[PDB]
C-alpha cells in the first residue's frame, strides 16, 4: 500500500468566474480534505472526518497563514511574469507533501510550475532547487541564499509532514478504510458480439476483472475502461471482449476479498 498528503496552490492572473485568483486544496490518498480560495478567504474541511477531529483553532490559524500565503503566491506570479515579460493570463502552481509507503520508506517532494510546465523542483537531500529555464535559475540562487529556509523545508517534508499524515489517516479511518462491494453485471453489445463486464459502487478503488474463455483461458483480446468516479464516493469500471459464435465466457471479479464469477450471454 501507500498513503500520501499533498497541498496544491494555484495563482491565476485573471480571477474569472469559477476560477478564483488563489486556490489551495489539500488531499489525502487523492481525497479532498481542505480548501481555500480568495472568494471565501477561509480554510474549510472538504471531508466530514476532518471537521470533527480538527478543533476550531486549526481552522483559524491556518486561514491567517493562507491569507498571508495568498499574497506571497500572487506576488511570485507577478515577479515571474516580469522576468518573462508576460502579460495576460498565466498560471503559477505549487505541489508540496509527503507520502508514507509500506516498508516505512517515506519520501518528500516540493515543486513549482508555471503555465503547466515545471518551473523549479526542490531536493531535500541536496538542500537545493532544480531549475528548468534561466528565469528559474535566478529563483534558485535567491531561494538558496537563506539556509534557514532550506533546512526548514527538509524538516517539514521529512518529519512534520508525516506526523500530519499519520494523524490524518487515523481520522476518518472509517471512511479511508471503508469497504463497499461492487454490483457486477454482464451485458451484450452486438456488432454493427461484444460482451461487457461492469461493476458499480465500490469504494476501495482497486478491483480486478479478468474475462475467462471456455473454462480456463484468459482472454487477451480485451479492452479496459479505468476506474471512473461515480459521485457518491464510489467508483465503476468495465471490460469488453469481442466474441464470436463459439460452441463459453466468464467474467472474474475480485474486490476486497469478495471473488465473484459471472456468466456471459
Amino acid at each position, epitope marked *: 500500500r501507500t498513503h500520501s498528503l499533498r497541498y496544491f496552490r494555484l495563482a491565476v492572473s485573471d480571477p474569472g468566474p469559477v476560477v478564483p485568483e488563489f486556490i489551495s486544496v489539500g488531499y489525502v490518498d487523492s481525497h479532498p480534505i481542505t480548501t481555500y480560495d480568495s472568494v471565501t478567504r477561509q480554510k474549510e474541511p472538504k471531508a466530514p472526518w476532518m471537521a470533527e477531529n480538527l478543533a476550531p483553532d*486549526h481552522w483559524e490559524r491556518y486561514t*491567517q497563514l493562507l491569507r498571508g500565503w495568498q499574497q*506571497t503566491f500572487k506576488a511570485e506570479l507577478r515577479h515571474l511574469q516580469r522576468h518573462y515579460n508576460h502579460s495576460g493570463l498565466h498560471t503559477y502552481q505549487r505541489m508540496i507533501g509527503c507520502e508514507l509507503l509500506e516498508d516505512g520508506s517515506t519520501t518528500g517532494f516540493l515543486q513549482y510550475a508555471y503555465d503547466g510546465q515545471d518551473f523549479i523542483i526542490f531536493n531535500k537531500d541536496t538542500l537545493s532547487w532544480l531549475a528548468m529555464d534561466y528565469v528559474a535559475h535566478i529563483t534558485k540562487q535567491a531561494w538558496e541564499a537563506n539556509l534557514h529556509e532550506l*533546512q*526548514y523545508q527538509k524538516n517539514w517534508l521529512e518529519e512534520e509532514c508525516i506526523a500530519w499524515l499519520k494523524r490524518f489517516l487515523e481520522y476518518g479511518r472509517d471512511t479511508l478504510e471503508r469497504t463497499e462491494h461492487p454490483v457486477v453485471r454482464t451485458t451484450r453489445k452486438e456488432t454493427f458480439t461484444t460482451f461487457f463486464c461492469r461493476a458499480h459502487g465500490f469504494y476501495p478503488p482497486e478491483i480486478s476483472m479478468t474475462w475467462m474463455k471456455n473454462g480456463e483461458e484468459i482472454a487477451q483480446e480485451v479492452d479496459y475502461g479505468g476506474v471512473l468516479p461515480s459521485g457518491d464516493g464510489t467508483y465503476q469500471t468495465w471490460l469488453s471482449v469481442n466474441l464470436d459464435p463459439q460452441s463459453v465466457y466468464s467474467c472474474h471479479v475480485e474486490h476486497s476479498g469478495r471473488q465473484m464469477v459471472l456468466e456471459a450471454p
Partner: antibody
Amino acid sequence: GVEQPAKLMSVEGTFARVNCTYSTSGFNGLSWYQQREGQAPVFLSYVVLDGLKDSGHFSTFLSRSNGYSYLLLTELQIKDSASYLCAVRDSNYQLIWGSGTKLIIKP
Amino acid sequence: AVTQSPRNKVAVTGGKVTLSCNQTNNHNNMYWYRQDTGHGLRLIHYSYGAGSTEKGDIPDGYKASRPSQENFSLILELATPSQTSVYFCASGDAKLGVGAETLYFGSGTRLTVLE
C-alpha cells in the same frame, strides 16, 4: 511549552553554554535571541536540523528527539553579559518564547 | 529599522493609549509583544498584511490596527494597571515561509498605568 534556566555565571574570556528545552506539539525551528538590559532582542542563530552550527564566535546545537538545544558562546567579554531567549515554532507556526537566561560575566 | 513611539508613557487608569510602530524593512508581518518579569515574550496582536489584523495570546483589553504596510498601532481603549509593561514591536519577511522567520524587534516602550 518552552523551559529555560534563569541565570548563568562564567569568567571573562571563557565560554558559557546556555540551554533550552522545548515541549512543543510540533517543531519547525529553534531561534536564539540576545536581549541586553534596556536594549531590544537581536537575532542570534536559527537551527532546525540536528547538529552544531559553527558560526565562529558562537555555536548552536540541536537535538530533536531529546527536544534540547544549547547556545555555545565563546570568547566572552563584558558586553556579552545579557539575557538569552530561545523561541520554538509550533506545528501551527506559533513562536513559543522562553523566559530567558541572564548570563552574567565575571570581570 | 524598526522604531516605536512613544518611547515612554505614563497613563491613568481608564485612559486612551495608542502605541504605534513604524518599519523601514519592507516586511508584511508586524507583531506586538509585552515583556514581563515572570513570563517570556507574549504576543498581543499581529498582522500579515495591510488591513488584516489578527489576535494573539493576550488580546484582553488590547486593540490593534494596521492602517498602512509600515504602521501597526496598538490601541488601549480603556487603560488599566495590569497593562503596565515594556512593549516590543517586531517585523518579519513573509516570503521566507512561515518557519524561518527572523523577527526584527524595535526598541522598548515603557508604559505605566497609575491610579
